[PDB]
Amino acid sequence: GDLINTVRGPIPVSEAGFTLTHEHICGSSAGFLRAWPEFFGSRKALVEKAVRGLRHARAAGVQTIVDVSTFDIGRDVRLLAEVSRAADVHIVAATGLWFDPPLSMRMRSVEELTRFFLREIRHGIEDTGIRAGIIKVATTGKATPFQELVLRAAARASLATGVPVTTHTSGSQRDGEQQAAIFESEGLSPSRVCIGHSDDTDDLRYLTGLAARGYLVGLDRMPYSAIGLRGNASALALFGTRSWQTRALLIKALIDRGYKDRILVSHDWLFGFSSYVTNIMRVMDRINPDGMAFVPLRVIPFLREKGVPPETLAGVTVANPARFLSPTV
Amino acid sequence: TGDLINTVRGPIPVSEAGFTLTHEHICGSSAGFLRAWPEFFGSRKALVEKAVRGLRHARAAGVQTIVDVSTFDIGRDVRLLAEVSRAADVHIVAATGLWFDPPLSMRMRSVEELTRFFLREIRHGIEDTGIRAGIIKVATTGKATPFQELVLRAAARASLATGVPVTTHTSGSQRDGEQQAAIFESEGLSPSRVCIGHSDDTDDLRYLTGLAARGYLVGLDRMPYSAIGLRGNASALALFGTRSWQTRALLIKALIDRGYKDRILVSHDWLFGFSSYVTNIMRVMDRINPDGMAFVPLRVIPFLREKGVPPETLAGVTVANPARFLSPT
Ligand SMILES: [Zn+2]
Ligand SMILES: [Zn+2]
Ligand SMILES: [Zn+2]
Ligand SMILES: [Zn+2]
């Protein structure tokens, strides 16, 4: 069977199992973790929290997370490897570019961005030999000309290697149509693309449209429920309405319409967050102490109460991630 | 009574500094970019080999020390600096602070948080290396942004606590030194601890003598950037400006012939690797200035001595002025 690159080497597809497709170990910035580890307290304390948070998720049944932290999110793959061993949970690193690219990237052409994505997928990240197994992009509304270059190079890298592509959208936007049109003009099939953060909006026909076209619907922000008055305006902006049941009911909504094979459910959670207000992580731990165990401990039983069969959720959590992470040339 | 400054190899006394270039770069990149994609420079080894050959060419021309004012967001690899320092046998001073390409993990911080980060790389060390920075680089492009004010204030407070000096980036034509000097003084920073850089990008001798009279060091640090009618490319004419190196060097004669030889610092603002601009800009630069950072001791100094400046006045500017500038209070 096919193999999938992890931060501990390649693993057979059958061993991925229960997989979260959009997660972060640390949401920071390029080189920030090395230069200022005291921002989190200490690098030792961040490894402790991440390892402890993953063993809690592993106890609930999670076996693999897809860390979609890219170069400009501060992806330190050695940190991803250290917590993958002490917790015994497969982690799949990513390549691509978020929406905080340093100008050493913003000045690059699409051909140059293609060679850098290919390097991290085929050669390895930095100097570790660890390769990524997924590509991450991002757009802010009407995508910038450079963001359009990024979307082009990611699809060209995906066509050469078969590695999938997952996107960042302000799900409360219609970046999906804009991202899909650029992907379709590059000849990439929608079965290798995930329009992430689709659970922010309540537009059902926008989700059904993506799935009917073959795209993977990433409902990957489940624990971000309505904040109420339990946080500042910064929290309410990034965490706010609606409730997590409203997000989880979008899984039930697509399943009832025959698109059970087009769903990927995750948390978009992290254990370190530097690209936002300070101590936002303590707010997120008040709202969700389960962390990456939220979906197995809370989302799965909530759907099961509403009459969703467990074989259907066993395909959304295991079958589709295995199908989507397998390099398809 | 016992003064010494931190280099990338460790503390050395001020007496052993000598001929010092006060604003140079080994590599102009972005944070974490060198180790993530070193093939952009052909190879990391080739970047070292070219850098070591360049500094030996400068020490053969009399250069004994340079200051690498590359910050975290300029791609400063303190280990790369330590390697080329021992290999070329040239003292190099590292730098903390922030340039005008900070990531989200930096733009989202407050004045105290940035003050602690600056104090970290000055007292504790940079990254996990134990190498301490001996200067602070701040940057405003025209009028200062609200974030750049917080940086300029965090540099003044960190300077007062450690006695370490501060150098700036200015769009010399817009006279950023006026607003920069006002905030440095509102934080209680003695003007003799600050150097307004890129002051030779303007002919405003009323603006230059004003800063020298107030007690600031004047950074005439872009000497080799002589604009040639090279036809292009448009990116080349935008980086080299419009004026000749004789015009830049004559600004040294004007400030000496004004009474402020104690207030001048001369440098190249040169580098051996450029990723934060267009591709192959480094080849165009080495084509124009083949002497690299030996341009000033080989061309500028003989030009000024031909214009009548005594060698004793020149020795104080290139040796005594930087030594006085780096010795902490
Ligand atoms: Zn996202
Ligand atoms: Zn995310
Ligand atoms: Zn500059
Ligand atoms: Zn510079």
Please report, for the domain that includes residue A278, its CATH number.
Answer: 3.20.20.140
User: What is the distance between the alpha carbons of residues A105 and A108, in angstroms, rounded to a whole number?
Assistant: 5
As residues whose CB is below 5 A from the ion ligand 3, the structure lists B 169
- Are the beta carbons of A262 and A15 closer than 8 angstroms? no
Is position A197 annotated in a ligand binding site? yes
Q: Is A118 on the interface with B (CB under 8 A)?
A: no
- Interface probe, candidates B40, B45, B79, B105, chain A, greatest A C-beta count within 10 A: B105
Cβ(B158)–Cβ(B115) under 8 Å? yes
| Cα→Cα distances A131→A6, A310, B80, Å | 7, 33, 24
A206 touches chain B (CB under 8 A): no
The answer to whether residues B31 and A31 touch, using CB atoms and an 8 Å cutoff, is yes
| Residues of chain A neighbouring B75 (CB-CB closer than 8 A) | 104
Region of B18 (left: φ > 0; alpha: ψ -120 to 50; beta: rest) is left
Burial classification of residue A205, based on how many CB atoms lie within 10 Å of its CB (0-12 exposed, 13-18 middle, 19 or more buried): exposed
Give me the residues paired with residue B264 across strands: B218
Look up residue B17 and give its DSSP letter.
T
Solved using: X-ray
In whole angstroms, give the CA distance from residue B285 to residue B290: 8
Q: CA of B201, closest CA in chain A: separation in Å?
A: 23
Whether omega before B109 lies within 30 degrees of 0, making that bond cis, reads no
- Cβ contact, residue pair B128, A32, below 8 Å: no
Is the CB of A30 less than 8 angstroms away from the CB of B37? Answer: no
How far is residue B286's CA from residue B107's CA, in Å, rounded to a whole number?
A: 34
Please name the residues in contact with A99: beta carbons below 8 A apart, sequence gap of 6 or more: A72, A138, A139, A140, A147, A168
Residue recorded with tokens 């012939």: B257
A86 to each of A50, A51, A80, B122, how far by Cα in Å?
A: 10, 6, 11, 34
How far is residue B242's CA from residue B228's CA, in Å, rounded to a whole number?
Answer: 8
What are the beta bridge partners of residue B126? Answer: B131
Give the separation between CA A133 and CA A161, rounded to whole angstroms: 10
Question: A228 is in which domain, residue-wise?
Answer: 1-329
Ligand nearest to the CA of A238: 1
Helix, coil or strand: residue B242: coil
Q: What angle do CA A308, A309, A314 make, to 5 degrees?
A: 110
Q: Is A71 on the interface with B (CB under 8 A)?
A: yes
Instruction: Note whether A34 contacts B120, CB cutoff 8 Å.
Output: no
- Kindly provide the residue ranges of all beta strands, DSSP E only, lying in chain B, ordered along the sequence: 4-6, 11-13, 20-24, 65-68, 91-93, 96-97, 136-139, 166-169, 194-196, 217-220, 264-266
Catalogue the long-range contacts made by A227-235 (C-beta closer than 8 Å, 24 or more residues apart): A227/A287, A230/A283, A230/A286, A230/A287, A231/A283, A231/A287, A232/A277, A234/A276, A234/A277, A234/A280, A235/A280, A235/A283
A253 Cα distance to chain centroid: 21
Q: Nearest ligand to the C-alpha of residue A99?
A: 1
CB B300 within 8 A of CB B64: no
Cβ atoms A102, B101 nearer than 8 A: yes
Q: Is A102's CB within 8 Å of B31's CB?
A: yes
Q: Which residues contact A215 (CB under 8 A, 6 or more apart)?
A: A176, A180, A190, A191, A193, A194, A195, A262
Q: Check B72 against A274: CB less than 8 A apart.
A: no
| Residues B59 and B34 sit within 8 Å (Cβ to Cβ) | no
Is B269 annotated to bind a ligand? Reply is yes
CA B172 vs. chain centroid, Å, equals 14
**What phi and psi, each to the nearest 5 degrees, are found at residue A217?**
-90, 105
DSSP conformation letters of A30-54:
TTHHHH-GGGGS-HHHHHHHHHHHH
Interface touch A71/B113, C-beta < 8 Å: no
Does the beta carbon of A3 lie under 8 angstroms from any beta carbon of chain B?
Answer: no
Ligand nearest to the CA of A267: 2
Q: Compute the distance between CA of residue B121 and CA of residue B98 in angstroms, rounded to an integer.
A: 12
Query: Between B35, B108, B279, which is nearest A275 by CB?
Result: B108
CB within 8 Å: A103 and B105:
no
Q: Containing H/E element for A115?
A: helix A110-118
**Which ligand gives the minimal distance to the CA of A66?**
2
Q: Which residues pair with A194 in a beta bridge?
A: A166, A216
Residue B29 contacts A, CB cutoff 8 Å: yes
Q: Which residue has the tokens 């020795």?
A: B315
Contact A273, A281 (CB under 8 A): yes
Please, after which residues is chain A broken with C–N above 2.5 Å?
Answer: none
The first and second tokens of residue B192, run together, are 């003799």
Write out the two tokens for A182.
């650029």
Q: What secondary structure does DSSP assign to A241-308, as a single string?
A: SS-HHHHHHHHHHHHHTT-GGGEEE-----S-B-SSSTTHHHHHHHH-TTGGGHIIIIIHHHHHHTT-
The two tokens of residue B178 are 């006026």
Q: What is the chain B residue with the closest CA to A34?
A: B127
Helices (H) and strands (E) in chain B, counts: 15, 11
For residue B234, the surrounding DSSP H or E stretch is helix B234-240
**Helix (H/G/I), strand (E/B), else coil: A29:** coil
Asked whether residue A123 is marked as a ligand-binding residue, the answer is no
The encoded tokens of residue A233 equal 């305006």
- Cα of A190 from ligand 1 centre, angstroms: 19
| Distance from the first to the final alpha carbon of chain A | 14
Number of domains in chain B: 1
A29–B104 C-beta distance less than 8 A:
yes
Q: What distances in angstroms separate CA A73 from CA A107, A175, B32, B167, one per listed residue? A: 18, 20, 11, 29
Which DSSP helix (H) or strand (E) runs through B249?
helix B245-256
Ligand 4 centre distance from Cα of residue B305 (Å): 26
* Residue written as token pair 């501990």: A8
